[PDB]
A paper describes a structure:
Ferritin ubiquitously occurs in animals, plants and bacteria, and plays a significant role in iron storage and detoxification. It is a nearly spherical 24-subunits-protein with exterior diameter about 12 nm and a hollow cavity of 8 nm. Like human H-chain ferritin, the ferroxidase centers of HuFtMt are composed of A and B iron binding sites of conserved amino acid ligands His65, Glu27, Glu107, Glu61 and Glu62. Herein, we take the compartmentalization concept to re-design the intrasubunit interface of ferritin to create a new compartment for fabrication of fluorescent Au NCs, while keeping the inherent protein cavity functional.
Therefore, to create specific Au ions binding site at the ferroxidase center, we re-designed these centers by genetically introducing cysteine residues as potential coordination ligands into them under help of the YASARA software in two steps. In contrast, two gold atoms are bound at the modified ferroxidase center of each 3Cys-ΔC subunit. Consequently, each 3Cys-ΔC molecule can accommodate up to 48 Au ions. Thus, these crystal structures validated our re-design of the ferroxidase center in atomic detail, thereby supporting the utility of the intrasubunit interface strategy for creating the specific Au binding sites. Among these three mutants, the as-prepared 3Cys-ΔC-stabilized Au NCs emit the strongest red fluorescence at 650 nm. To characterize the core size, the as-synthesized Au NCs were analyzed by high resolution transmission electron microscopy (HRTEM). According to Fig. 3b, the 3Cys-ΔC-stabilized Au NCs had spherical shape and were homogeneous in size, which was defined in the range of NCs (< 2 nm). We believe that the higher stability of the 3Cys-ΔC-templated Au NCs stems from the prevention of the excessive growth of Au NCs by the size-constrained ferroxidase centers which are buried within four α-helix bundle. The CD spectrum of the 3Cys-ΔC-templated Au NCs was nearly overlapped with that of protein template alone, indicating that protein secondary structure remained almost unchanged upon incorporation of small Au NCs into the intrasubunit. Thus, it appears that incorporation of Au NCs into its intrasubunit does not interfere with the formation of iron cores within the ferritin cavity.
Numbering used by the authors:
A (entry chain A), B (entry chain A), C (entry chain A), D (entry chain A), E (entry chain A), F (entry chain A): 6 to 176
The structure:
Amino acid sequence: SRVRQNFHPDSEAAINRQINLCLYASYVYLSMAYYFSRDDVALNNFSRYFLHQSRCCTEHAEKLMRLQNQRGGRIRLQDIKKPEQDDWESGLHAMEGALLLEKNVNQSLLELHALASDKGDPHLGDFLETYYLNEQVKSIKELGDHVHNLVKMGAPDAGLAEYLFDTHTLG
Amino acid sequence: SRVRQNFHPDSEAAINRQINLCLYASYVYLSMAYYFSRDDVALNNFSRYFLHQSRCCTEHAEKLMRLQNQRGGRIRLQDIKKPEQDDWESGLHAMEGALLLEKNVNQSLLELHALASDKGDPHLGDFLETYYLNEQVKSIKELGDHVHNLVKMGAPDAGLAEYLFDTHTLG
Amino acid sequence: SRVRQNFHPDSEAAINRQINLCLYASYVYLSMAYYFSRDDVALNNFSRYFLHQSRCCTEHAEKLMRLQNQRGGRIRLQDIKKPEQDDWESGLHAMEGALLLEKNVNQSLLELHALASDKGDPHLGDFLETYYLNEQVKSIKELGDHVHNLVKMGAPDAGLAEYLFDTHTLG
Amino acid sequence: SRVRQNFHPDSEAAINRQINLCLYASYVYLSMAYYFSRDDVALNNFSRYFLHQSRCCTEHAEKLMRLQNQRGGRIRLQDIKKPEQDDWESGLHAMEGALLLEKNVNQSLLELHALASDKGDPHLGDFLETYYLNEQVKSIKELGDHVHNLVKMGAPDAGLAEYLFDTHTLG
Amino acid sequence: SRVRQNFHPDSEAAINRQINLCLYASYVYLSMAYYFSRDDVALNNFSRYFLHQSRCCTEHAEKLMRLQNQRGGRIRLQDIKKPEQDDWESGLHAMEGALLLEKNVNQSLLELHALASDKGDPHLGDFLETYYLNEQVKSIKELGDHVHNLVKMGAPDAGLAEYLFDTHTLG
Amino acid sequence: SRVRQNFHPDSEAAINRQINLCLYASYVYLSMAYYFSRDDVALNNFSRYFLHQSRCCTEHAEKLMRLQNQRGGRIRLQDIKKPEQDDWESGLHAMEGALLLEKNVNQSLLELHALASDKGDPHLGDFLETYYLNEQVKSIKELGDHVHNLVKMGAPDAGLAEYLFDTHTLG
Ligand SMILES: [Au+]
Ligand SMILES: [Au+]
Ligand SMILES: [Au+]
Ligand SMILES: [Au+]
Ligand SMILES: [Au+]
Ligand SMILES: [Au+]
Ligand SMILES: [Au+]
Ligand SMILES: [Au+]
Ligand SMILES: [Au+]
Ligand SMILES: [Au+]
Ligand SMILES: [Au+]
Ligand SMILES: [Au+]
């Protein structure tokens, strides 16, 4: 590419892997969003919350695709794997699944940053720091908060817990 | 499900297949969108055009997921297959690929409508007619228009054709 | 902590030390602020200037406390030592004391950044770069400017110097 | 000091002690504020509530420093001791700790007022009455209200109590 | 300098070299801008485009001069060399020359960043990342886009190519 | 050139020399501007004043480049020489240097006008009269005013002089 400069083939490949992972995380969140609008779950603010999470991950996936083009890399898409479950069991189980998902996404981003550093690619390092790493920390912290409150309130077995959390925290 | 009524298991399964197909079509269009923002393609209104196509297909996929929940069906997600190509070759090739994609999506919707009719599900039939069938006809017609003009202008080999089409029709 | 990831115990401890140092710097500046509103000093814009410096350091201390929580560390507070003097002697002496204070704070931040780099913590490195390191450089530069002008004007012994600097530069 | 009049050295010293105590109370409240934004506590309106308490105590400390200067006294700062705990255990425990803290601060203010009266310093007595004594009574009453409601709701062991109090009373 | 801290003499010297290079790039772009307003070239949006490029490089040069002062370095100016050509031959030749110029400027910035990293100067590294490295990537990508479209349209020999590109892309 | 009329080759060459001289004067003023934002000079309105002088000279250089194109001449750029000093010593020394610079620029413009008159080029003569000669007289007069006041105030050795001039005249 006539724009390519200081852009290692390993970084290009790692960006393509991260694109797939952010698309996958978007899909997991979409699955969770529509679990909570089932007639036998019906927690509409959990639904809205995870739909917003899904949009955020889609935006980050697209920004990585833009980055690939900006640097002269070439996007290579792969299948987006279906999520591990269609039935997410409870508000608490979904929040815990989201927390684990984001820590896995965070680990991948940190490994991508370490690669960028190894290859002396400060543009890529800054891109990750500016748009990904602190956003990931904020989301993980928020999910941790939500898990804590749900557990303390007695979710999933206490009948009022997820209902009240849906209407107060996620409202 | 305590909401389920007149909703055949075959229709539920066929809705799950259509959800996957609309997500797949969304992915194809996303792939096309970022092909046109490559530095060696750089047709930004083709890029915008296919990104909009992608959003429309995502909306239709989500509306089918909502429908499944509304009727008491259960969403079952599957892998979203990667598109057939990462390199879409030209503006004309992409428009022709999109036209073929939409005719395939349209055929699936029409088969879904025929199933709904066979199972005496007028709610499902109306849902498809109201939100899917005429939108598909409009999009196919528009893609046909675009293919015709691109071919007549001399795309892909004529150097001004896709450039001028990008700036005039898709601008 | 269920949110903790890639966060080294040394970094957590170093953050707790920096919190104490930023609180201490806030206290020094508060002391300076109220020195200049003594009836036998009465330089109200020096007073306002150092009060603003104090608020800025309090904000940075709180942002480090927020960071500790965001990353799953645990805040451990220590005594905030009283400043070295209650009588800051003159506008020039206070500005020189502030310059030395900020260089000490800056050195601590740079050592914290070097630790973050050693521990492969790019989130922490970026946090320091984004919110602390350039703000410190700007403040040190401004204090250098003020010291230069005060010295050139003949502070502290020239009777008009601090009075005129208070009303023109700090007004 | 050429402004000093009817201002007893004991009152000056007692004002310096009260400044340290109000700064200490500010620090305790800051500690409490950031306890409630831990991922394993996550009661953000408790956090906001105690942060506001902290700002109020900082304002009262500064107003005492202003008073010292207004009367021709000389501010003598001392170390601000760290709070007794970093882990405040629960919303109820923190509210009870705050109530005890404010009664101790109130006792010190009342002793300061008695000193002012003994030394025939009505300006100092009025300053305390106008800006400190009724504000202290209001805050103690409010903390008493909060403690009562938390206890009645079943805090800290009842899972919904602090969550609901956070969102309704402190929201 | 009484403000100088953690600022290596090599970094100071390298900043002075980068200032000259950004001023030089500004001069090249100014030369290109007025080539396109010749009566025998007369592509006024090419002219505007390169004038804007020139202003951007002047701003970056001045920001490096500000940085030198902020850190306590001392600006040392050198001759600004005249550009390689006064006659830039065509819109396509100028865009290709600009692309090569920016890659050379980018290489210098990346080497400056590597120096900052070697000398443990995170303030300088962040300054380059925040204000220079991503701006350079964006400009190189845009120039790549423009070169691609011009080539595909048949520039410089096809009579309509640069005229149409001037009025559509650069308008 | 098909636009060229009554435009002598000597005038074209002399215009190219004046372009270089106005660019050089712009560079001198830029150097002066950033001398006054050194931490050990820190006269920010001197800095602003000379930056404005620099922009004015850049505008006049560009207007001469436009003139060359308007008349069918061909711009030939040369190196822009670095200024005589990086350290401008004082506000007074810089103002005196600027006065000498502008008289040299003025002499060149007057010689250019005499050439235009010799070659019977009234368009060029009017261009110089309308945009250059009275602007030069105004700037020289202003610099003379500033030099006079600085000298009378006791610059550079009197500590208040440049400080007060910076804040009152140049503010
Ligand atoms: Au993601
Ligand atoms: Au997001
Ligand atoms: Au679709
Ligand atoms: Au659509
Ligand atoms: Au601080
Ligand atoms: Au600040
Ligand atoms: Au207090
Ligand atoms: Au208060
Ligand atoms: Au530049
Ligand atoms: Au720029
Ligand atoms: Au000039
Ligand atoms: Au001017």
